[PDB]
Amino acid sequence: KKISNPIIPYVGTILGGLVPGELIVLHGSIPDDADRFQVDLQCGSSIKPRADVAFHFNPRFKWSGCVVCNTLEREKWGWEEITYEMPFQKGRPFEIVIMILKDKFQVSVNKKHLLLYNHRISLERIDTLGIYGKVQIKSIEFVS
Ligand SMILES: CC(=O)N[C@H]1[C@H]([C@H](O)[C@H](O)CO)O[C@@](O[C@H]2[C@@H](O)[C@@H](CO)O[C@@H](O[C@H]3[C@H](O)[C@@H](O)[C@@H](O)O[C@@H]3CO)[C@@H]2O)(C(=O)O)C[C@@H]1O
Numbered sequence: 001k002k003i004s005n006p007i008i009p010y011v012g013t014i015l016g017g018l019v020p021g022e023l024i025v026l027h028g029s030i031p032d033d034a035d036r037f038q039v040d041l042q043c044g045s046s047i048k049p050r051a052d053v054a055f056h057f058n059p060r061f062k063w064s065g066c067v068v069c070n071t072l073e074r075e076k077w078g079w080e081e082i083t084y085e086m087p088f089q090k091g092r093p094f095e096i097v098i099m100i101l102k103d104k105f106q107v108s109v110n111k112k113h114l115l116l117y118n119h120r121i122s123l124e125r126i127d128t129l130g131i132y133g134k135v136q137i138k139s140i141e142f143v144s
Contacts, residue, residue, distance in 0.1 A: 003140040010131040011045050014142065018126050023143040024098040029136045032091045036060045037133030039096065041126045050075050051128065054121035055105055057098070059088050071120040083115045093138075 001015055018024075018041070026039065037059060043052040053072035060066055065086025071078045087109040088094055099106040100123065107114045131137055 006137055006140060008131060008137060010137065012129055014127055014129050018100045018123055020100055020102045022100045025141045025143055026096040027138040029093040030088050030090050031134050034061055034090050034134035037135035040130035042128040042130050043125045045128050052121060054126050055117060069117045078120065081117060085114065087112060087114060
């Protein structure tokens, strides 16, 4: 389903899960005082024990800024993949597009390539989208 101005923190089921070729399109904005936010593609929404996170996409505004990606499995974070770019800007709107491929997620921000991330958890296990932190979201759309 298309989601408009969701409640942040957002935790919602992804109807039909994800398949290769599909896009997750997020329109949102960053508050003036943001420190970080994250978009998590999860297996369920359990809090204790904490739901596995197949893909954690985590922009951090400190210093020059970076984006940390990782996977949480059995309540433990794996090895981080850090992209030392920061396309997000405080006080500004953004578009994130996550392209789902057989081997990787490919992420663009504001129609510019940002990063690739190899799957660590099988794609079919993802059933939940989580968005947390200092971020506002105008819309979430899943494109077939
Ligand atoms: C209640 C709360 O604050 N939850 C946040 C958690 C916890 O603080 C954390 O799990 C410890 O209890 O962390 C979230 O942020 C983590 C996540 O971005 C992962 C991704 O790899 O990195 C963690 O920080 C790393 C850091 O990047 C490393 O350099 C190293 O120093 O270790 C730390 C800790 O592992 C983040 O804490 C989370 O989702 O787990 C955000 C939560 O709001």
